[PDB]
Amino acid sequence: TIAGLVFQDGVILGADTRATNDSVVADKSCEKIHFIAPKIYCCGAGVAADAEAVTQLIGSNIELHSLYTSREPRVVSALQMLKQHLFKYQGHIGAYLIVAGVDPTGSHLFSIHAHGSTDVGYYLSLGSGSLAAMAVLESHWKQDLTKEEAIKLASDAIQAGIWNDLGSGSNVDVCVMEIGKDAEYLRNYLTPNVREEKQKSYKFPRGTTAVLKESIVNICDIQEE
Amino acid sequence: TQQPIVTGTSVISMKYDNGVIIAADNLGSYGSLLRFNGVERLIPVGDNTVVGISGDISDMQHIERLLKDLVTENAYDNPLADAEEALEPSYIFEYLATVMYQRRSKMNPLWNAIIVAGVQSNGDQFLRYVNLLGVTYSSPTLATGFGAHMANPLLRKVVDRESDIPKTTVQVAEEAIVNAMRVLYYRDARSSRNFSLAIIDKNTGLTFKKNLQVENMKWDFAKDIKGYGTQKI
Amino acid sequence: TTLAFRFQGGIIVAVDSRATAGNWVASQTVKKVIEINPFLLGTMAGGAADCQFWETWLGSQCRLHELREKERISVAAASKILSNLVYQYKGAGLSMGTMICGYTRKEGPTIYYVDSDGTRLKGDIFCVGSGQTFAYGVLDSNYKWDLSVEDALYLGKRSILAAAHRDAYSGGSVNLYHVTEDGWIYHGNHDVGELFWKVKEEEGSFNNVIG
Amino acid sequence: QFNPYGDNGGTILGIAGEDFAVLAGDTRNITDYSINSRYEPKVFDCGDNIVMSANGFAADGDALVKRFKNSVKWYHFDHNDKKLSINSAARNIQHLLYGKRFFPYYVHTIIAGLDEDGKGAVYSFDPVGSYEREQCRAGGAAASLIMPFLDNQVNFKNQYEPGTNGKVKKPLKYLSVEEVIKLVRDSFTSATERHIQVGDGLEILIVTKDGVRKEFYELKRD
Amino acid sequence: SDPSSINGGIVVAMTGKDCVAIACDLRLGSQSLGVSNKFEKIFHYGHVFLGITGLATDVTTLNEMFRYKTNLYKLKEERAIEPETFTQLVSSSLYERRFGPYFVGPVVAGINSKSGKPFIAGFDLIGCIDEAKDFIVSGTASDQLFGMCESLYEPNLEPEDLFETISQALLNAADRDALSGWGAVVYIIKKDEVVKRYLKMRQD
Amino acid sequence: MDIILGIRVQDSVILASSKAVTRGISVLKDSDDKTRQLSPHTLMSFAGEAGDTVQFAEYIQANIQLYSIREDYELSPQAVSSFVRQELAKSIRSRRPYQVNVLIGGYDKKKNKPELYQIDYLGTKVELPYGAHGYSGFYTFSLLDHHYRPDMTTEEGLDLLKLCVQELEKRMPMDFKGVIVKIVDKDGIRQVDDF
Amino acid sequence: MDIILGIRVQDSVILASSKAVTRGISVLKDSDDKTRQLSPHTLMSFAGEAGDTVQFAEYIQANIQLYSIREDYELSPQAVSSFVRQELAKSIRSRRPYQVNVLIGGYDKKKNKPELYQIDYLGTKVELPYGAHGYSGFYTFSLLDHHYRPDMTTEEGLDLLKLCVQELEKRMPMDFKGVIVKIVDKDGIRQVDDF
Amino acid sequence: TSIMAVTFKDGVILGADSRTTTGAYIANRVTDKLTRVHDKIWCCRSGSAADTQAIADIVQYHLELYTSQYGTPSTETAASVFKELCYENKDNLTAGIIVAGYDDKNKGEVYTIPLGGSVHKLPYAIAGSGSTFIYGYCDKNFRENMSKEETVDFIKHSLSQAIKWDGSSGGVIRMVVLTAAGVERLIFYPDEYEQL
Amino acid sequence: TSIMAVTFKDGVILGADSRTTTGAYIANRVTDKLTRVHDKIWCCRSGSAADTQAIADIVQYHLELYTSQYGTPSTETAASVFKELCYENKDNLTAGIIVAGYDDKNKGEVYTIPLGGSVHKLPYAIAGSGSTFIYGYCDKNFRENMSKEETVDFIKHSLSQAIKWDGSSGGVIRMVVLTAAGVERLIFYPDEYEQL
Ligand SMILES: *C(=O)[C@H]1NC[C@@](C)(O)[C@](O)([C@H](CC2CCCCC2)NC(=O)[C@H](Cc2ccc(OC)cc2)NC(=O)[C@H](CCO)NC(=O)CN2CCOCC2)O[C@@H]1C
Ligand SMILES: *C(=O)[C@H]1NC[C@@](C)(O)[C@](O)([C@H](CC2CCCCC2)NC(=O)[C@H](Cc2ccc(OC)cc2)NC(=O)[C@H](CCO)NC(=O)CN2CCOCC2)O[C@@H]1C
Ligand SMILES: [Cl-]
Ligand SMILES: [Mg+2]
Ligand SMILES: [Mg+2]
Ligand SMILES: [Mg+2]
Ligand SMILES: [Mg+2]
């Protein structure tokens, strides 16, 4: 469940922290809000390695470009490079991305599909939890939201995802990118799913397990005279 | 085995302190073509039950008839037909859930998902789901098609569990339903603006409102969106 | 993994106790031998439901026969009711491989293999199931007609242990039966968990394994 | 094509103590990535001190529980109100299931109660009616997560007496109902963490000579 | 046909108090046929441990590939690679074969020799990194390991307690998998000590 | 193509390899040697698709012979097995893989130890006390689990292989026309000419 | 299984039928008789799908045996063959055809003449001096087309059959575990015990 | 999608709905389907969103390099580059593009490039899934040399019928006016056009 | 096929084109697609020509036996008969039928039965391959309580457009007028309707 929306003087991103393999949870605390530049972030949905690899690739190139041009990197640059690279691979890099940031041109919010289509928007959601999120965003989004409002709406859109979508779960990560300020990354912004204390401790009496042989492993380099 | 041809989209509904609310748009779709702009998909049975039907309209029109024929049959040699031996919502649901599951088991299903909304003899709320597979489930909020994905999130924010039902008034609940229908109109390409809504309340009975319309639609922000990325004009 | 062989001292029957759902181990404690009467045994391999049901149903039919004919059923006649039954279902996807093992006066100790494609064979040695090849290898290499009852039990056991080890789809435990003039005798459940280590130590076999 | 089957997820768990049995199930009902209900009961009192769950395709599971409940009603009628023993129930369900061997019920069935010696009993069935009596069984989506835990904790598998080198097994014991419920709750917390179809609620039906008692515990709702 | 389940095998990694544990089974088979009861899936470069489940030809290939890269690394950096850095190398190396993957489930375990901080990670076959605080699971009985770990596990276990926990996770999960077992190995790892133990398990 | 066995005893490795080359309906030959000497003390038996088998073995044989001339030295069995596994491991991600399974039986003159390596067409290497490719294993691994010891003499190893050959002739559907048998030991590679 | 041969000589018919019963990877039996006596002077050998073969053989047997009691008389081989043919020809257009091929060897006591009939599962009948079903024919027919003479004795029939088995044991891929041989003459049916 | 361009006395007008769909889910309800390849040459996009974005981008690149060297390219030249891409990659493209632009010589010009990658110069053009419903209407109601206000009405009425009957169309009706005066963007909300 | 029925002040009119195709071959250019099931209950057929003929023949039978027993059936009862057949045999049928009839009580009624076998009572109805192209035109030009001359024209213009765009349609426009006055058959030839 990934989302982003614009507010008065910036843009905000939200994401859940669940990774799935078929029907099992592979990860309960993964970061879906990837770094591209200091003030450009990318929410990732779809094939996990694909979303992670394509944001790292473009983020690496945006850094070399920033160095080369002696300028703050623009969101439309990250947008173009993600979109041209996904397009080249005709969907086979199964990455669904929400791009947002501040640059010298102002604040920006874009969605990117696996085949290389881009959308412009004031509020966007992507992934299995996107309909749960888009229902909250379509109920409560207005123009000139304050930051306190924006963070409430974004985190409510991800919660819709967590509760109502099996594909989404665990915690809410948020990233705030206000104009003329440092972007603030708020990993575990909400923690609404802490496992309740267990009934028992399953710690075994020592010697419970039958052992055939023992040996010391040599991990040091050169045992020496 | 068939394939649905003319189809009706989301039916959404919820329990509140005294009764149940159920709503459905007035569209019969023919694939992508928005063919029929006057189709009623909430069918009341007596004064205590509304059956909300989504899927193939021909299979819905058949179920309509089954229910109309059921009222007739229930009257036969039943001096108490309009009192203690009137049809209950639970009796109507169980009839449909029987038929639905027998049609799937003959590999000739009725291509529908059905919410039975109503209030029982004793004033208890009744909300139960049945579809073409004969799968059944009850919840304080129920929705079919897009409404499962978009309406349920919104309606569960009001009634997230059983103990929330007595704290929810008919004004709160209706407002939640009318809002959810607007969401569904923004985001379902096979929905319409013109919808119907029924409240079944254990005091005021069955209110059936026709020709409702989504309003307070927010489009303004559209004027500012230009191109798909780098375009400024 | 099921086997049954004939020898000087009658019949030896041994089965494993594992049930599967693909690579999911469903159980390690299953019975694969139905006791049809005091003189008649059934082994089970294939569809869990197919074997349990139709061999239970075979017991019914063996009981009706002795009510109607005031006579214990022949192993031939019992094996041929199951084989004629499955032959009616042929093509419908039943999965059964089974040995009807029993003693009558007229026949002496007898073994009939029956499978869901309708094969019915009499013989002195059968191994049936995913593990049959592992069992055959040990059994065929130690088999004589004139083993002691004690030795024949051990071989039948050891043949199932052999298959329990190598075959991914066999194991749990070895159930042992001995059929004589006097009828079948249970000779115990032997958990592979404990039996593998005792056999390794005592026999000095299984030198493939870190012991 | 029309696919007559579906998957409502959910997970169930039977454990047989000395003079009692439990049958537990999550109350969550799903299709695909949608939640249908957070409270849709799945473990039913069928009478005669027999509790039963048919977990999988919920429609087939309802059909079966509904047909077994009726089976019980007719066994009273046809056999002068005689109590249907669990072993007799187990055999009856085999016939119910196997009747549909060539168009099965897509369910894994556990029943629990007391045998005719007053001792706790769990019976367990594949979709076409194979069955075995056990101390332990988990069914449904998270069976593969739970059964190894039950193997370890209820049947003391792979556990040996400390200081016996590895030659004396931990001796088998009957657990108290207090101890069994802790295992049940810990099994469903665990499953809920790692399986996206397990959560919302845990309902436990406990069966003793005195009758059928219920317990309900919240599970995580994500 | 499914490469991830021809040979079988499981690996499980747990963190404890100033320690990590990694353990594997010893089975290698061709589906139903068991072949080797000595096939170890845990390898080490310096003090960084790698368990690998999946297609056995890829298990062997990737070990030979990570011995090669970690040897050069050490010759240039003049120091052993650390678990955090090795994890990235594995991910890089899996993702470079994105459209022709190795059919493996890698698991990194070790202690940062500078910070003294215990570290485990796991990967999908194309390099997505899962960096768990508690435990990682891989192989044909992964579901069974998730269930065992999620119940049995508790944080800050001493070396001799974590040994008992991890052993009981593997052994009971292997016994509900047809393609795992046949013996098992557990590595107890401390900052400047590493014990290796062969577990007596059922041979079916 | 449907039976190659090997067994490592105390002081030697014995490879046993069926003589039948069958195509469809006809047995074309009953005296086929499914083997190549890789170096004086290293013998590789092979079984798999037609052409592929000999083409692979003769390619491996050339390469080890080229190595032996270049260094004027014989590679350890462990080295030759590793070379081979890598050629198959490279081959499985090719346009058209070698569909060949192999046993490698060697006497390492450095460690004075016999060594047996089973490698399948995927590049799956294992050192074993006894090995088999194809359906043979299904019978012979249980036999050898029962009757093998690691201190057996070469005659005891040959007696143990007769049981494997008797049991395969008893229970296997195809007529494989017996085995050629070769012993690898400190003195090199010899063929037992009566079996 | 697989190989059923028949040779009609001067004054007898000789059926030869393989003793193996194989299912997938294991030879389950090596002493199987693939023949039912239909009447004292008429023998049917059968091969094809498992289950079908014995069910169809014993079905034909009971029907002929019934006819023998009802008329106190023995149907000619020609009558038995035409009845069998029509049962198969009826079967081929059933819901589930009998997948069974048969040879019928009879001594017609009315004409004092041995007769061999070859019938396939489609109900294709032919009277032949020698016959075979499945892959056997591809070898044994050319062999008999060379060595066969109509005026041969039974001892010469048996030699001519030993030539057919030796060739089949040389050039066929699957071990059929020898043949059971039966002579049908004026005196009835007997089994040659050592072959 | 529902898109058209109409030549009138003073220049040309591009029209489009704002609905983007992933099956029956509206992925974006305020899509801008009117895209600038040059100051006074715009196109309407229909087909694969990815495909037509990639294409319009390359075309914008080509016309920008054209302008650097040879100055302002004709509408025809913009059509020709769209065609070249569409035609030569027809085996991997689902693009149906309408090209519309203003010169002072040629005045208003509309070209349509359907799934063939063929080119057709037309007084007006309709395309997208919603266009099937309004062939009848548009053929009956179109005239040459309409005023600006007439042409805004013709498109607003036409796209309105297209949106009503096509589930894949909907939202706001965006237009772009192209004359010697310059470049005027228009928007019309549902509460205006629905009640026509 | 292009088929429509429209209710006006004096009753109802059915209109159809005359073109039957096998692929792109016109098997019949003078088909009468307006088929009598009773004195003043007609239908227009679309889909499988076998299937709709079988159905119309069976309904003509049911309404003849109805008239024998219970007098003149309502247009609603004809629609129900058409629906009962179409719904119940939906897996072996490809029938899109419009039913139109005149009572003195109910005046003009129109029912449409699309593929699945559903029934829809409507002021007017259009159907067949050619109908997609006039949903826009018909919606903008239909009024209730039109005169006979207005309804002939509305139908003639509408089918004229469906014919222009649809290759599966063409030939002559057949109309059947159902009033108190009786039954009037109108034909219109290409040289009239094309130049509209
Ligand atoms: C909100 O809507 C969330 N819904 C959850 C989820 C899981 O769908 C996801 O898209 C998430 C994306 C994040 C995960 C954390 C890292 C950044 C990306 N995706 C996954 O968790 C992804 C599921 C998935 C599998 C396959 C496909 O296409 C076939 C799409 C999605 N999981 C994985 O990729 C796992 C990670 C293993 O730990 N591995 C595999 O699926 C392995 N296969 C990948 C496909 O190719 C074969 C190998 O988050 C959204 C935002
Ligand atoms: C020795 O060789 C053993 N090999 C192990 C094994 C497991 O293959 C088996 O055949 C064992 C037989 C015993 C019989 C007595 C009752 C316990 C089981 N078979 C199974 O465990 C059987 C495997 C199997 C599955 C499917 C088919 O045909 C499709 C054949 C065999 N298991 C089952 O049937 C499972 C039991 C789960 O509790 N259930 C299903 O597979 C459910 N499906 C059944 C088929 O129809 C769809 C539902 O023992 C031999 C002796
Ligand atoms: Cl777009
Ligand atoms: Mg969960
Ligand atoms: Mg195991
Ligand atoms: Mg095993
Ligand atoms: Mg629309």
SS3 per residue for A113-160: CCCCCEEECCEEEECCCHHHHHHHHHHHCCCCCCHHHHHHHHHHHHHH
Look up the CATH number of the domain holding residue B167: 3.60.20.10
CATH of the domain spanning D1-222:
3.60.20.10
Q: Which of C137, C203, C131 is nearest to C167 (CA)?
A: C131
- Direct distance between the N- and C-terminal alpha carbons of chain D, in angstroms, rounded to an integer: 33
Cα separation values, G131 from B49, G4, G76, Å = 80, 8, 19
Q: How many CB atoms lie within 10 A of CB B69?
A: 10
Measured CA to CA, the distance from residue H182 to residue I4 in angstroms comes to 46
G87 neighbors G94 (Cβ within 8 angstroms): no
Pair H149, H142: CB distance under 8 Å: no
The catalytic residues of I are 1
Chain A CB contacts of E133 under 8 Å are 29
For residue D179, what are the CA distances in angstroms to A72, C87, D120? 62, 51, 15
Does C166 contact F141 at a Cβ distance shorter than 8 Å?
yes
Query: HEC states along chain D?
Result: CCCCCCCCCCEEEEEECCCCEEEEEECCEEECCEEEECCCCCEEEEECCEEEEEEECHHHHHHHHHHHHHHHHHHHHHCCCCCCCHHHHHHHHHHHHHCCCCCCCCEEEEEEEECCCCCEEEEEECCCCCEEEECEEEEECCHHHHHHHHHHHCCCCCCECCCCCCCCECCCCCCCHHHHHHHHHHHHHHHHHHECCCCCEEEEEEEECCEEEEEEEECCCC
What residues contact I176, with CB distance under 8 A and at least 6 apart? I13, I14, I34, I42, I183, I184, I185, I186
I129 near I166, Cβ under 8 Å? yes
Q: Residue for token digits 């997948």?
A: G99
Question: Could you please report the per-residue DSSP string of F113-139?
Answer: EEEEEEEETTTEEEE-SEEEETTHHHH
**Unique residue bearing structure tokens 């999130």:** B153
Q: Which residue has the tokens 């129930």?
A: D89
For residue A225 the two structure tokens come to 């005279």
- SS3 of chain C: helix, strand, coil, percent, to 5: 35, 35, 30
For tokens 């982003």, name the residue: A4
Query: Six-digit token pair at D154?
Result: 């209820």
B35 touches chain I (CB under 8 A): yes
Q: How many domains does chain G have?
A: 1
The owner of tokens 């389950």 is G28
**Ligand nearest, relative to CA of residue D141:** 4
Spell out the SS3 assignment of C68-133. HHCCCCCHHHHHHHHHHHHHHHCCCCCCEEEEEEEEECCCEEEEEEEECCCCEEECCEEEECCCHH
Estimate the share of chain B in helix, then strand, then coil, as percent rounded to the nearest 5. 30, 30, 35
Q: Which of B141, B39, B19 is nearest to B89 (CA)?
A: B19
- Residues 6+ away with beta carbon under 8 Å from F75: F39, F42, F64, F67, F68, F83
Q: Is the distance from CB of E137 to CB of E88 less than 8 angstroms?
A: no
Q: Tokens 């029934």 sit at which residue? A: I119
Tokens of B223: 């004027």
Q: Give me Rg for the CA atoms of chain B.
A: 19
Confirm if F43 and F34 have CB atoms less than 8 A apart.
no
| CB-based burial, I30-49: b 16+ in 10 Å, e otherwise | ebebbbebbebbbbbbbbeb
- Exposed, middle or buried, A203 (CB in 10 Å: 0-12/13-18/19+)? middle
| Ligand 2 in reach of C45 Cβ (< 6 A) | yes
Tell me the C-alpha distance between D194 and D175, whole Å. Answer: 26
E174 backbone dihedrals φ, ψ, rounded to 5°:
-65, -35
Segments making up each domain of chain H, as ranges? 1-196
Domain of residue F57 covers 1-195
Q: Is C189 in the pocket of ligand 2 (CB under 6 A)?
A: no
Answer whether F125 sits within 8 Å of E60, measured CB to CB: yes
Residue C52's closest chain D neighbor by CA?
Answer: D130
- Closest CB to B137 among D1, D4, D40: D40
- From E201, B3, D153, B188, select the one nearest A200 (Cα to Cα): D153
Contact B138 D34 (CB under 8 A): no
C145 Cβ under 8 Å from any chain E Cβ? no
Q: Tell me, in angstroms, the distance from the centre of ligand 6 to residue E55's CA.
A: 20
CA proximity to A133, closest of A156, A157, A152, A165 = A157
Provide the token pair at F114: 């016999």
Give, in order, the Cα–Cα distances in Å from B5 to each of E178, F189, I96. Answer: 48, 77, 12
The Cα–Cα gap between G176 and F185 comes to: 38
DSSP 8-state symbol, H166: B
Q: Are B116 and B49 in contact (CB under 8 A)?
A: yes
Long-range contacts of G110-117 (CB under 8 A, 24+ apart): G110/G76, G112/G186, G114/G8, G114/G9, G114/G10, G114/G11, G114/G12, G114/G13, G114/G184, G114/G185, G115/G8, G115/G13, G115/G77, G115/G78, G115/G81, G116/G6, G116/G7, G116/G8, G116/G13, G117/G77, G117/G81, G117/G84
Q: Does A217 touch chain C if contact means CB atoms closer than 8 Å?
A: no
Pairwise CA distance, residues F38 & F59, whole Å: 10
3-state SS, residue H21: strand
Indicate the pairing of strand H173-179 with strand H124-127.
unpaired
Q: Which of I133, I140, I153, I145 is nearest to I193 (CA)?
A: I153
Radius of gyration of the CA atoms of chain A, in A: 21
- Helix, strand and coil in chain G, % to nearest 5: 35, 35, 30
Check residue B220 and report its DSSP letter.
G
Identify the residue whose C-alpha is closest to ligand 2 atom 12.
C45
Residue I110 backbone class (left: φ over 0; alpha: ψ -120 to 50; beta: rest): beta
Annotated binding site of C for bortezomib: 48
Tokens, residue C147: 């083993």
Task: Output phi, psi for G189, to 5 deg.
Answer: -120, 130
Q: How far apart are CA H40 and CA H182, in angstroms?
A: 8
CB B209 within 8 Å of CB B198: yes
Structure tokens at A201: 């401790």
- CB of E8 within 8 A of CB of E167? no
Cα separation, I75 vs D149, in Å, equals 70
CA of H131 from ligand 7 middle (Å) equals 13
Backbone angles phi, psi at I139, to 5 degrees: -60, -40
Residues of H acting as catalytic residues: 1
Query: Which helix H or strand E contains G77, and what residues bound it?
Result: helix G77-91
* Contact criterion met (CB below 8 Å) for G47 and G1: yes
Q: What span, in angstroms and rounded, lies between the C-alpha atoms of I72 and I63?
A: 8
Q: Which helix (H) or strand (E) holds H95?
A: none
Buried b (16+ CB within 10 A) or exposed e, E30-46: bebbbbbbbbbbbbbbb
Ligand nearest to the Cα of E184, by number:
5
Q: Which residue of F has its CA nearest to C209?
A: F145
Query: Whole domain around residue E195: which residue ranges?
Result: 1-204
- Taking a C-beta distance cutoff of 8 angstroms, is the pair F105, F114 a contact? yes
D105 close to C49: Cβ distance less than 8 angstroms: no
Q: Which of A47, A89, A113, A136 to mutate to test the pocket of ligand 1 (most atoms within 8 A of CB)?
A: A47
**A219 CB-side CA count, 13 A:** 25
Residue in E123, E92, E95 with CA at minimum distance from that of residue E13:
E123
**Cβ contact D142:D187 at 8 Å:** no
Which residues, including other chains, have CB under 8 Å from residue B106's CB and lie 6 or more apart? none
Q: Under 8 Å CB-to-CB from H70, ≥6 apart: which residues?
A: none
**Which residues in chain H touch residue A120, judged by CB atoms under 8 angstroms apart?**
32
Question: Which residues neighbour E120 within 8 Å (Cβ) at sequence distance 6 or greater?
Answer: E13, E14, E15, E20, E22, E107, E108, E109, E131, E132, E135, E136
- Residues G152, G160: contact at Cβ < 8 Å? yes
CB B152 within 8 A of CB A160: no
Compute the distance between CA of residue H14 and CA of residue H11 in angstroms, rounded to an integer.
Answer: 11
User: From the CA of D145, which ligand is nearest?
Assistant: 4
| Range of the structural domain that residue B107 is part of | 1-233
Among the listed residues B64, B57, B62, the one whose alpha carbon sits nearest the alpha carbon of residue B7: B57
The secondary structure of C121-147, three-state, reads EECCEEEECCCHHHHHHHHHHHCCCCC
- The candidate with the shortest Cα–Cα distance to A123, out of A2, A16, A33, is A2
Integer Cα distance of H102 and H181 in angstroms: 10
- The C-alpha atoms of residue F97 and residue B77 are separated, in whole angstroms, by 81
Angle, helix E56-77 to helix E83-95, in steps of 10 degrees:
130
Are residues G127 and G22 in contact, defined by beta-carbon separation less than 8 angstroms? Answer: no
CB contact under 8 A, F27 and G172: yes
Min Cα separation A220/chain B (Å):
55
Please, are residues D65 and D110 in contact by the beta-carbon 8 Å criterion? Answer: no
Dist CA E36 CA F126 (whole Å): 7
Instruction: Give domain I1-196's CATH number out of 3.10.20.30, 3.30.450.20, 3.60.20.10, 3.20.20.450.
Output: 3.60.20.10
Which of I7, I11, I1, I3 is closest to I179 using CA atoms? I11
Q: Considering only CA atoms, which of C188, C182, C180 is closest in space to residue C156?
A: C188
Task: Considering only the beta carbons, identify the residue of I116, I132, I135 that sits closest to B57.
Answer: I116
Residue C102 contacts residue C66 (beta carbons within 8 Å): no
Structure tokens that stand for I3 in this block: 């088929």
Binary contact (D6, B133; C-beta < 8 A): yes
Residue of chain G whose alpha carbon sits nearest to that of F174: G174
Q: Does B2 touch chain I (CB under 8 A)?
A: yes
Residue position matching structure tokens 């057929």: I45
Would the CA dihedral through F48, F52, F56, F58 be positive or negative? positive
**Is-contact I41 I101, C-beta < 8 A?**
yes
Q: How many CB atoms lie within 10 A of CB B216?
A: 7
Angle between helical axes of B89-105 and D58-78 (0-180°, round to 10)? 100
C31/A111 Cα distance (integer angstroms)? 59
Token pair 């254990």 is found at: B202
C-alpha–C-alpha distance, residues A180 and A195, integer Å: 39
Q: Which residue has tokens 């019914």?
A: C60
How far is residue C139 from each of residues A206, F142, F171, measured CA to CA in Å? 42, 10, 12
Task: Kindly provide the resolution of this structure in angstroms, with one decimal.
Answer: 2.8
Q: Do the Cβ atoms of F124 and E7 come closer than 8 Å?
A: yes
Contact C207, F149 (CB under 8 A): yes
Alpha-carbon distance F192 to F185, whole Å?
A: 13
Structural domain count of chain B: 1
CB contact under 8 A, B6 and I117: no
Ligand 2 atom 46 nearest Cα? D128
At E72 the three-state DSSP class reads helix
The helix or strand, by DSSP H or E, that contains position C155, with its residue range, turns out to be helix C149-166
Q: Which of C118, C126, C133 is facing G51, going by the closest CB pair?
A: C118
Q: What is the 3-state secondary structure (H, E, C) of chain I?
A: CCEEEEEECCEEEEEECCCEEECCEEEECCCCCEEEEECCEEEECCECHHHHHHHHHHHHHHHHHHHHHHCCCCHHHHHHHHHHHHHHCHHHCCECEEEEEECCCCCEEEEEECCCCCCEEECEEEECHHHHHCHHHHHHHCCCCCCHHHHHHHHHHHHHHHHHHCCCCCCCEEEEEEECCEEEEEEECHHHHCCC
Residues 6+ apart with CB under 8 A from D196: A20, A23, A24, A25, A166, A167, A169, D33
Helix, strand, or coil here: F2?
coil
For residue H48, how far is its CA from the centre of ligand 3 (angstroms)?
9
Look-up of token digits 């590789």: F44
Q: How far is CA A125 from CA A15, A120, A136, A138, in A?
A: 9, 12, 10, 11
Type and span of the H or E element at F48: strand F42-48
Domain of G20: which CATH number? 3.60.20.10
User: Residue E104: enclosing H or E segment and its boundaries?
Assistant: strand E104-111
| Strands of I173-179's sheet in order across | I124-127, I3-8, I11-16, I173-179, I182-188
